[PDB]
From a paper:
HMGB1 contains two DNA-binding domains, box A and box B, which have little sequence specificity but have remarkable abilities to underwind and bend DNA. The HMG box is the defining and characteristic domain of the HMGB family. This domain comprises three α-helices with an L-shaped structure, in which helix I and II form a short arm and helix III together with an N-terminal stretch of amino acids forms a long arm. HMGB1 box A is an exception because Ala16 at the 1° site cannot intercalate DNA but Phe37 at the 2° site can, and this is thought to be responsible for the superior ability of box A to recognize pre-bent DNA.
These duplexes form a pseudo-continuous helix throughout the crystal. The two box A domains bind in an approximately symmetric manner about the dyad axis of the palindromic DNA decamer, with water-mediated interactions between the domains. Thus, this collaborative binding mode, whereby the 2° intercalation residues of two HMG box A domains act in the same base step, has not previously been observed. At the kink in the box A–DNA structure, the minor groove widens, the major groove narrows and the DNA is underwound; in particular, the C5G6/C15G16 base step has a roll angle of 74.85°, a twist angle of 4.82° and a rise of 6.64 Å, compared with standard values of a roll of 0.60°, a twist of 36.00° and a rise of 3.32 Å for B-DNA.
Author numbering:
A (entry chain A), B (entry chain B): 5 to 79
Write the structure that this text describes.
DNA sequence: ATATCGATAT
DNA sequence: ATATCGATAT
DNA sequence: ATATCGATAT
DNA sequence: ATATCGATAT
């Protein structure tokens, strides 16, 4: 086998949603990576635990994917 | 210890020099990652075999770094 | 360490 | 797999 | 890309 | 066994 992909954190899932939002608001634009990161991170800082929760549940699931795949990985 | 950093390819070393060039030509601009990557890769394609050679020697050395460090890595 | 945002190369 | 280009969070 | 590994065909 | 191809993992 191959080395399993690293764990995707709750923030990593959240960044994907930021990019979705951004695409709808600016369907044309190239992403300014530096500004985009700063904006997502400022938005995440102000989110409540409720809004966060769905991203935490994605992360819990990927933590499970990762633990499962690592069982069989032989380096 | 920690996992050694992955091998830096001849191109990865080149992209650092592209950014240097770019900063001198456009000190004020934020990097458009998508466009930067496309321009770096066009430049790499047309760069002379002599110029490329120096990046290939950095990569050879980093390969040696990596092989040495991996001897003592325990996952 | 490794991942996201894009594109790319080794 | 892993790295670059920037900033960031887990 | 590339180094390495396995299956196949000889 | 060995030469080759081409998948696999990096
Ligand atoms: Mg990485």
């Amino acid at each position: 086998g191959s080395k399993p992909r690293g764990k995707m954190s709750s923030y990593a899932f959240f960044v994907q949603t930021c990019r979705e939002e951004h695409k709808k608001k600016h369907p044309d634009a190239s992403v300014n990576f530096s500004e985009f990161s700063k904006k997502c991170s400022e938005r995440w800082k102000t989110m409540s635990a409720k809004e966060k929760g769905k991203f935490e549940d994605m992360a819990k699931a990927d933590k499970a994917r990762y633990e499962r795949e690592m069982k069989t990985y032989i380096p």
